[PDB]
Amino acid sequence: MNLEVLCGRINVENGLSLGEPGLYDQIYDRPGLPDLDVTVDATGVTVDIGAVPDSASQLGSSINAGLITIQLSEAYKINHDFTFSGLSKTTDRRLSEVFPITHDGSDGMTPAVIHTRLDGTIVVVEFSTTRSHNIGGLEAAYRTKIEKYRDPISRRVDIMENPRVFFGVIVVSSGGVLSNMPLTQDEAEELMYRFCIANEIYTKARSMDADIELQKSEEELEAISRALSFFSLFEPNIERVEGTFPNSEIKMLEQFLSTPADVDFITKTLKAKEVEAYADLCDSHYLKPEKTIQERLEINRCEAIDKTQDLLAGLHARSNKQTSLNRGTVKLPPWLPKPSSESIDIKTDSGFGSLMDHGAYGELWAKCLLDVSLGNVEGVVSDPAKELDIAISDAKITYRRFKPALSSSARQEFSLQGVEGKKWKRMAANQKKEKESHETLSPFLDVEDIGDFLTFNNLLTDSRYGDESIQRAVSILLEKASAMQDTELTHALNDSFKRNLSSNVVQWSLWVSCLAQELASALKQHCRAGEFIIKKLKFWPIYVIIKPTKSSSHIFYSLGIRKADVTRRLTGRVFSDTIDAGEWELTEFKSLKTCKLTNLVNLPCTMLNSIAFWREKLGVAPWLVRKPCSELREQVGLTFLISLEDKSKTEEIITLTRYTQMEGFVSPPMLPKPQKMLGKLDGPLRTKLQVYLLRKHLDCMVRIASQPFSLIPREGRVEWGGTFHAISGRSTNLENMVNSWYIGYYKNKEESTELNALGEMYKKIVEMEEDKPSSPEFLGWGDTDSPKKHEFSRSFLRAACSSLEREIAQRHGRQWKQNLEERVLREIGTKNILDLASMKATSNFSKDWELYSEVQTKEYHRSKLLEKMATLIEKGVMWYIDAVGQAWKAVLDDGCMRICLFKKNQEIYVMDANARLVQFGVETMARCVCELSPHETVANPRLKNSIIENHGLKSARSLGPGSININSSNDAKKWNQGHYTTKLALVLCWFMPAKFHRFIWAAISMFRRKKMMVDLRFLAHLSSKSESRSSDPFREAMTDAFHGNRDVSWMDKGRTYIKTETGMMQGILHFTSSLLHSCVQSFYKSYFVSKLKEGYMGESISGVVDVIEGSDDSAIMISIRPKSDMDEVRSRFFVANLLHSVKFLNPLFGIYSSEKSTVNTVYCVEYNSEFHFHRHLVRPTLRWIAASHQISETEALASRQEDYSNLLTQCLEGGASFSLTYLIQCAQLLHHYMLLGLCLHPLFGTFMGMLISDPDPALGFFLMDNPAFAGGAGFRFNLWRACKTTDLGRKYAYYFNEIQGLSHSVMVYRKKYQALLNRMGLPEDWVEQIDENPGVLYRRAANKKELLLKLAEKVHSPGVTSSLSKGHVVPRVVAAGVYLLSRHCFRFTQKASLIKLLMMSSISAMKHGGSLNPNQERMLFPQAQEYDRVCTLLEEVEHLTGKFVVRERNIVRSRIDLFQEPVDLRCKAEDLVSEVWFGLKRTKLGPRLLKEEWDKLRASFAWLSTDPSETLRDGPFLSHVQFRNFIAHVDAKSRSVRLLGAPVKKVTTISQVVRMNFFPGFSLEA
RNA sequence: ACACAGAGACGCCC
């Protein structure tokens, strides 16, 4: 290893070439540990390096044994000295040696070695080593080195003639190396190894010595002192803990620590379970007798038929046996009226006398029509004439509440369908309806109209409604938006979107969404008994009769339309029947909740997205027209049906076809066994769609077992043939089959849970409690060959803990416990209580809410952590380490730990504040250990993508050319409530120093006696019913436990809580479970490596084993090199048995394998949800397309588009193209203008027409982007182009030209904010006290007042506005859209309407001519240089040309450095303001280097001053609160993208990506 | 109509 070869091979060009940071990981196995001795004396350090072990050459052969010492002055750079011993040439060239003179002050720095080539080409490099565990240290050190040695070395370039200079820095850390030169991944290992040895030397020297230490900081002394004092003085009173908490004795811990693990038991148990696994494999896959794979596959098929025919004999017996049913799937009429204008045409050729004859709906409609026609029409349709007055000049919406007479028969018929049916329950006709409604359907029900609907439907035909009001409005808005990028590429995609918008399904979804939008605003209204509300849709003549109930209950509607009006109808028999009343079509009363008003409002946008997505995935070009194929129609119809049904179990049947179809990827000798998921598809059937889905799922279940997917290796890449859609029966390619598993994600996640269905989550919580062992001897005391439930083996746990120590000491050195202790002490001691108090909710279930017959008249509320830390502030604590003792005392005195349960969705374990304070330290301790694990991903985010990809490099170097890789995905059964806390305590205490033992033992032991509180409204309807008639065991047992008939081990008589001892929780204990499973997986890896050393007949099968682990899911990779056909067969059999043994070896650790694990797959593995088919990484883009419209509640109108762009970029990162992203953005435009009031407000034409003359995102304008780089650029780039292209920049000049001597429209949307403010007692001085002394805001928290003021500032922030909200965003936001434009809603005091703001901006702010001068440009947009050089490359393609190339089969995940960082900005401006204001050092610039930027900022922003008081008086920011957010929110930030596609090695990469990723199989070219 | 292997809602308040 020498630097001269590296300097001779480097590619250096004339000018300023800086390259790009290339990151290299640790992929190779380091040989051994250089045992060494360190002695401290005054004469040096006397390092005695021993003979390093060396079994494999390279990566550790450069170490020379001998006696070397360093005097006690260069002891702070032992890492730097030893790491770069072979590279640090003693040349010592000062910068004045190669450059004549500059005299810039910093003229005496020597950038390490600056050795040049023969042709005078100067190459400069600096060496640096940091002790960091993540890339957050690597990139930081890189940036520090660049900012320190860039401008000095670049100042000498302009004076020279033809300079050729290259600047790069190498940063070495234990775990990864970051550099600029092309390292060979062989000397990088050398550098990392020598860094590890140097870290060992420095740690050993620093241990016994104390004077040799770099002065770290003054701040990192108090934290260590506080933490050490606490852990030396905290006595948790263990002698009371054992008597209070069950199964908690320190003797168990000391015996576990001080006893070696027995080897005889481990060998015998392993050998027994191995032959048990072999016997199971022989029995369950028909290996014996010896049969070829035709007849055993036929046996598998017939056996799967035998299982699948028995499920449809127990589903057919607990249900009614009706084989014919006329129930409709879609509860909406299939009408497609033409979009006319607002005109009430209720007059008929034959008068309202024929309506009286047809049923009761006809009579109701007739009475309504007589009331409307011969009455005052003031609420049916809004009147724009008397609407401007409240809008253009300086809660009250009107509705037509008519009261018909109706007969008792008609009222009863209405009451059958739920309309005012609470009073009518007792009569006979309602009881029969209620009794029949509970029955489940039969699997043999005849459904064939659903199957016919998916084959022949006119959902995609073009309706000639492209010249109507709504379509023309959308076209005008789109043309206005796409005016700064007017090319052919934009026009073609706009034409495609316009053509997609005129489909039958989209036109139907438009008025369906309008109806849902209008219903969403009708919940907030109440009416007396017998009242109804009549109204009309905006662009369609459809009349709705609405019956609001409570605003949290059902709302009822009926639809009516003239028969001659219905021009076209949809084809299919999946729609509900309609009443034919003369020349009128009427609809029965239907119900709809507030949580089901989300998929209906978003229906047209989802339909458009589905059309575009499946059109590209079938290969159809977006700029062409084709007759729709039979594949597109089936997928669109399936999406339509799933969106319109919106039921929980419908999602599960489609969700559980992935695990059905990952079988068939299983290679011989193992057989595909899909008949393992039959235990999950055992539930009630309540809709005709679920029966069809179940039958199709069983058909594909048999089809998979009949034959697996073929493997066709053509050349260099393997391909699978035989793939098919699960519920379609049709054959497609691999990616369509992969992402058709996520069609069930169109169902809304956020459904409220009724009190009827609340008992299932308690069943899931309490199901493992009846299996508690009677005598605890196997719970952490001894060993067992065959442990029972909840039991584990101590010897195997110790073996796993020891196995995950030889993977830690081999990377971070033999001295890691000391560094771990220092990091943990620093992390715990540096946390203040102000870092706590988030928006998370606590619980108030302490002692009084315990007996049920006391709190009957009391309603129970939760709380928030804010008040619970505010009371500690008022009592007075400043550090987290002080409050934890009082928390422990409170927990110990009341000997329990309190949990409340609150799901209300489709869980959550909220916890008391004291328990949160106690468990925060334990989570902090576990997190610092999880980041030291080689294969643990939930604490190391970079490891998911960097350990499966690096398996190929190891398998190629170590084995050779051509290796059979064999993977095995594995996921576990009920991970929660299946782990005993003693396991976690012992595993965590194995890795701690002796001081973190009593604390962790006491903190963990509190989890073992729980008390979960159940809902009071559940108990209200449980005390009344003495005996239950339910056919469920849990329902029959719970009421007896509550009343007293039974004596059940988890509830008492009359109490309102649930006791549980055996179990962990989801959430709270997160990193400890990951650590335990990492120990288990390290044991498996060691055991597999041990078995591969042996073999079938004493012959060693060469291969490598890789393991990836998270928190709940894991995978195992094995690759071998047989080079013999008989050895091929026998080696694959051995590896298959070895991978099958994991299921039997798991229960020894208290871990249960699930039925959703795929074992023994050759070239396929999925880890989280990421499929790795050889070189064809697939992510499901449909998962992120289905969640594109999941916006949150924000106040500013410019904050909606930021969330829209945030949702838009994630689908692009998921595999979407650029045309797809542009179309999704068009759909988002439609969604934004719909929630802005497109078809809800009558005064929208004026607002739109006046928005044409004034584009402004903060005023409600949606900005599009370039339809070639469609997702990479964020909202800032769009804002920059808008302000530099149109009147936005010219109009914005008044904000620095009119006030010389960013959103200003804040919405008001809110009843539980003032209560929160007064609850935690903020004084009414929180703003003026900051105004006089801004010291409390920037510096630090010193005492009570600073903490209180900083907390008051934190509460009054925009983050709490988004955080404190309900879960239903879209209906709540669109409900306020009915009055947004007209009524006074916005704020600047002086609340006004949107029309008023738009008018006042028109005549005052617009009358200007000019542009923003290019000196304030680098304040709003301090990132504009690379804006310009990216926009320049984007300004190269303006037409639609190119050729349809053939795809390349190398799809990999890339990373494009779109916006690295501008280095000329020399960090940020807020720290500079604090520097010049507060007398605090905050910028990394020395004497007078802090200057030369104050003048620049003063030129950028006027009226600033060095004195804090002058800046207050000068500008509009008449406070010190708003100015902090103003200066902080607009600043330069790094932007990157992770696009998926063909690999790129080495500005041309962006053009390459644009030219390849515009459309798959298409190249734009030139 | 919604929910559920019949635990709820189909309004509160006077």
JSON list of N, CA, C and O in Angstrom, two decimals, chain A residues 1113-1137:
[
{"chain": "A", "resi": 1113, "resn": "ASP", "atom": "N", "xyz": [-39.30, -9.08, 11.92]},
{"chain": "A", "resi": 1113, "resn": "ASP", "atom": "CA", "xyz": [-39.14, -9.84, 10.70]},
{"chain": "A", "resi": 1113, "resn": "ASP", "atom": "C", "xyz": [-37.64, -10.00, 10.45]},
{"chain": "A", "resi": 1113, "resn": "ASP", "atom": "O", "xyz": [-36.83, -9.17, 10.86]},
{"chain": "A", "resi": 1114, "resn": "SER", "atom": "N", "xyz": [-37.28, -11.10, 9.78]},
{"chain": "A", "resi": 1114, "resn": "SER", "atom": "CA", "xyz": [-35.88, -11.43, 9.58]},
{"chain": "A", "resi": 1114, "resn": "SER", "atom": "C", "xyz": [-35.73, -12.28, 8.34]},
{"chain": "A", "resi": 1114, "resn": "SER", "atom": "O", "xyz": [-36.71, -12.74, 7.75]},
{"chain": "A", "resi": 1115, "resn": "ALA", "atom": "N", "xyz": [-34.48, -12.48, 7.93]},
{"chain": "A", "resi": 1115, "resn": "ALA", "atom": "CA", "xyz": [-34.17, -13.30, 6.77]},
{"chain": "A", "resi": 1115, "resn": "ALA", "atom": "C", "xyz": [-32.79, -13.91, 6.92]},
{"chain": "A", "resi": 1115, "resn": "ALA", "atom": "O", "xyz": [-31.95, -13.40, 7.67]},
{"chain": "A", "resi": 1116, "resn": "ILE", "atom": "N", "xyz": [-32.56, -15.01, 6.21]},
{"chain": "A", "resi": 1116, "resn": "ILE", "atom": "CA", "xyz": [-31.30, -15.73, 6.23]},
{"chain": "A", "resi": 1116, "resn": "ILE", "atom": "C", "xyz": [-30.88, -15.99, 4.79]},
{"chain": "A", "resi": 1116, "resn": "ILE", "atom": "O", "xyz": [-31.70, -16.43, 3.98]},
{"chain": "A", "resi": 1117, "resn": "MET", "atom": "N", "xyz": [-29.61, -15.72, 4.48]},
{"chain": "A", "resi": 1117, "resn": "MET", "atom": "CA", "xyz": [-29.07, -15.94, 3.15]},
{"chain": "A", "resi": 1117, "resn": "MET", "atom": "C", "xyz": [-27.89, -16.90, 3.22]},
{"chain": "A", "resi": 1117, "resn": "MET", "atom": "O", "xyz": [-27.01, -16.74, 4.08]},
{"chain": "A", "resi": 1118, "resn": "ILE", "atom": "N", "xyz": [-27.88, -17.90, 2.34]},
{"chain": "A", "resi": 1118, "resn": "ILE", "atom": "CA", "xyz": [-26.80, -18.88, 2.26]},
{"chain": "A", "resi": 1118, "resn": "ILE", "atom": "C", "xyz": [-26.47, -19.12, 0.79]},
{"chain": "A", "resi": 1118, "resn": "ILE", "atom": "O", "xyz": [-27.38, -19.29, -0.03]},
{"chain": "A", "resi": 1119, "resn": "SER", "atom": "N", "xyz": [-25.18, -19.12, 0.46]},
{"chain": "A", "resi": 1119, "resn": "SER", "atom": "CA", "xyz": [-24.72, -19.41, -0.89]},
{"chain": "A", "resi": 1119, "resn": "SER", "atom": "C", "xyz": [-23.61, -20.45, -0.83]},
{"chain": "A", "resi": 1119, "resn": "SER", "atom": "O", "xyz": [-22.75, -20.40, 0.05]},
{"chain": "A", "resi": 1120, "resn": "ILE", "atom": "N", "xyz": [-23.63, -21.39, -1.77]},
{"chain": "A", "resi": 1120, "resn": "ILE", "atom": "CA", "xyz": [-22.69, -22.51, -1.79]},
{"chain": "A", "resi": 1120, "resn": "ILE", "atom": "C", "xyz": [-22.13, -22.67, -3.20]},
{"chain": "A", "resi": 1120, "resn": "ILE", "atom": "O", "xyz": [-22.70, -22.15, -4.17]},
{"chain": "A", "resi": 1121, "resn": "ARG", "atom": "N", "xyz": [-21.00, -23.38, -3.32]},
{"chain": "A", "resi": 1121, "resn": "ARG", "atom": "CA", "xyz": [-20.39, -23.66, -4.61]},
{"chain": "A", "resi": 1121, "resn": "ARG", "atom": "C", "xyz": [-20.17, -25.16, -4.78]},
{"chain": "A", "resi": 1121, "resn": "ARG", "atom": "O", "xyz": [-19.09, -25.66, -4.45]},
{"chain": "A", "resi": 1122, "resn": "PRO", "atom": "N", "xyz": [-21.16, -25.91, -5.28]},
{"chain": "A", "resi": 1122, "resn": "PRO", "atom": "CA", "xyz": [-20.98, -27.37, -5.39]},
{"chain": "A", "resi": 1122, "resn": "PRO", "atom": "C", "xyz": [-19.98, -27.81, -6.45]},
{"chain": "A", "resi": 1122, "resn": "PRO", "atom": "O", "xyz": [-19.06, -28.57, -6.14]},
{"chain": "A", "resi": 1123, "resn": "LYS", "atom": "N", "xyz": [-20.16, -27.36, -7.71]},
{"chain": "A", "resi": 1123, "resn": "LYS", "atom": "CA", "xyz": [-19.36, -27.83, -8.85]},
{"chain": "A", "resi": 1123, "resn": "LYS", "atom": "C", "xyz": [-19.40, -29.35, -9.02]},
{"chain": "A", "resi": 1123, "resn": "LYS", "atom": "O", "xyz": [-18.42, -29.96, -9.44]},
{"chain": "A", "resi": 1124, "resn": "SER", "atom": "N", "xyz": [-20.54, -29.96, -8.70]},
{"chain": "A", "resi": 1124, "resn": "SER", "atom": "CA", "xyz": [-20.81, -31.37, -8.98]},
{"chain": "A", "resi": 1124, "resn": "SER", "atom": "C", "xyz": [-22.30, -31.64, -8.85]},
{"chain": "A", "resi": 1124, "resn": "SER", "atom": "O", "xyz": [-22.92, -31.22, -7.87]},
{"chain": "A", "resi": 1125, "resn": "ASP", "atom": "N", "xyz": [-22.88, -32.35, -9.83]},
{"chain": "A", "resi": 1125, "resn": "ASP", "atom": "CA", "xyz": [-24.34, -32.52, -9.87]},
{"chain": "A", "resi": 1125, "resn": "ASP", "atom": "C", "xyz": [-24.85, -33.33, -8.68]},
{"chain": "A", "resi": 1125, "resn": "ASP", "atom": "O", "xyz": [-25.85, -32.97, -8.05]},
{"chain": "A", "resi": 1126, "resn": "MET", "atom": "N", "xyz": [-24.18, -34.44, -8.37]},
{"chain": "A", "resi": 1126, "resn": "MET", "atom": "CA", "xyz": [-24.55, -35.20, -7.18]},
{"chain": "A", "resi": 1126, "resn": "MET", "atom": "C", "xyz": [-24.33, -34.37, -5.93]},
{"chain": "A", "resi": 1126, "resn": "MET", "atom": "O", "xyz": [-25.17, -34.35, -5.02]},
{"chain": "A", "resi": 1127, "resn": "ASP", "atom": "N", "xyz": [-23.20, -33.65, -5.87]},
{"chain": "A", "resi": 1127, "resn": "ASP", "atom": "CA", "xyz": [-22.97, -32.73, -4.77]},
{"chain": "A", "resi": 1127, "resn": "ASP", "atom": "C", "xyz": [-23.94, -31.56, -4.80]},
{"chain": "A", "resi": 1127, "resn": "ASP", "atom": "O", "xyz": [-24.30, -31.06, -3.74]},
{"chain": "A", "resi": 1128, "resn": "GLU", "atom": "N", "xyz": [-24.38, -31.13, -5.99]},
{"chain": "A", "resi": 1128, "resn": "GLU", "atom": "CA", "xyz": [-25.46, -30.15, -6.07]},
{"chain": "A", "resi": 1128, "resn": "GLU", "atom": "C", "xyz": [-26.69, -30.63, -5.31]},
{"chain": "A", "resi": 1128, "resn": "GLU", "atom": "O", "xyz": [-27.20, -29.94, -4.43]},
{"chain": "A", "resi": 1129, "resn": "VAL", "atom": "N", "xyz": [-27.15, -31.84, -5.63]},
{"chain": "A", "resi": 1129, "resn": "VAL", "atom": "CA", "xyz": [-28.36, -32.37, -5.02]},
{"chain": "A", "resi": 1129, "resn": "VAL", "atom": "C", "xyz": [-28.19, -32.52, -3.52]},
{"chain": "A", "resi": 1129, "resn": "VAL", "atom": "O", "xyz": [-29.04, -32.07, -2.73]},
{"chain": "A", "resi": 1130, "resn": "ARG", "atom": "N", "xyz": [-27.07, -33.11, -3.09]},
{"chain": "A", "resi": 1130, "resn": "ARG", "atom": "CA", "xyz": [-26.94, -33.41, -1.66]},
{"chain": "A", "resi": 1130, "resn": "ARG", "atom": "C", "xyz": [-26.68, -32.14, -0.85]},
{"chain": "A", "resi": 1130, "resn": "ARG", "atom": "O", "xyz": [-27.17, -32.01, 0.28]},
{"chain": "A", "resi": 1131, "resn": "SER", "atom": "N", "xyz": [-25.93, -31.18, -1.41]},
{"chain": "A", "resi": 1131, "resn": "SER", "atom": "CA", "xyz": [-25.70, -29.92, -0.72]},
{"chain": "A", "resi": 1131, "resn": "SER", "atom": "C", "xyz": [-26.99, -29.12, -0.59]},
{"chain": "A", "resi": 1131, "resn": "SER", "atom": "O", "xyz": [-27.25, -28.51, 0.46]},
{"chain": "A", "resi": 1132, "resn": "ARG", "atom": "N", "xyz": [-27.81, -29.10, -1.65]},
{"chain": "A", "resi": 1132, "resn": "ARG", "atom": "CA", "xyz": [-29.08, -28.38, -1.55]},
{"chain": "A", "resi": 1132, "resn": "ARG", "atom": "C", "xyz": [-30.01, -29.05, -0.55]},
{"chain": "A", "resi": 1132, "resn": "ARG", "atom": "O", "xyz": [-30.73, -28.37, 0.19]},
{"chain": "A", "resi": 1133, "resn": "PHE", "atom": "N", "xyz": [-29.99, -30.39, -0.48]},
{"chain": "A", "resi": 1133, "resn": "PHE", "atom": "CA", "xyz": [-30.78, -31.08, 0.54]},
{"chain": "A", "resi": 1133, "resn": "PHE", "atom": "C", "xyz": [-30.31, -30.73, 1.94]},
{"chain": "A", "resi": 1133, "resn": "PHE", "atom": "O", "xyz": [-31.13, -30.48, 2.84]},
{"chain": "A", "resi": 1134, "resn": "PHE", "atom": "N", "xyz": [-28.99, -30.69, 2.15]},
{"chain": "A", "resi": 1134, "resn": "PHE", "atom": "CA", "xyz": [-28.44, -30.34, 3.45]},
{"chain": "A", "resi": 1134, "resn": "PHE", "atom": "C", "xyz": [-28.82, -28.93, 3.86]},
{"chain": "A", "resi": 1134, "resn": "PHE", "atom": "O", "xyz": [-29.22, -28.69, 5.01]},
{"chain": "A", "resi": 1135, "resn": "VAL", "atom": "N", "xyz": [-28.73, -27.98, 2.93]},
{"chain": "A", "resi": 1135, "resn": "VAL", "atom": "CA", "xyz": [-29.06, -26.59, 3.24]},
{"chain": "A", "resi": 1135, "resn": "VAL", "atom": "C", "xyz": [-30.56, -26.44, 3.49]},
{"chain": "A", "resi": 1135, "resn": "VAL", "atom": "O", "xyz": [-30.98, -25.67, 4.37]},
{"chain": "A", "resi": 1136, "resn": "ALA", "atom": "N", "xyz": [-31.39, -27.17, 2.74]},
{"chain": "A", "resi": 1136, "resn": "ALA", "atom": "CA", "xyz": [-32.83, -27.12, 2.96]},
{"chain": "A", "resi": 1136, "resn": "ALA", "atom": "C", "xyz": [-33.19, -27.64, 4.35]},
{"chain": "A", "resi": 1136, "resn": "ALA", "atom": "O", "xyz": [-34.03, -27.04, 5.04]},
{"chain": "A", "resi": 1137, "resn": "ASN", "atom": "N", "xyz": [-32.58, -28.74, 4.77]},
{"chain": "A", "resi": 1137, "resn": "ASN", "atom": "CA", "xyz": [-32.82, -29.25, 6.12]},
{"chain": "A", "resi": 1137, "resn": "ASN", "atom": "C", "xyz": [-32.33, -28.26, 7.17]},
{"chain": "A", "resi": 1137, "resn": "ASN", "atom": "O", "xyz": [-32.99, -28.04, 8.20]}
]
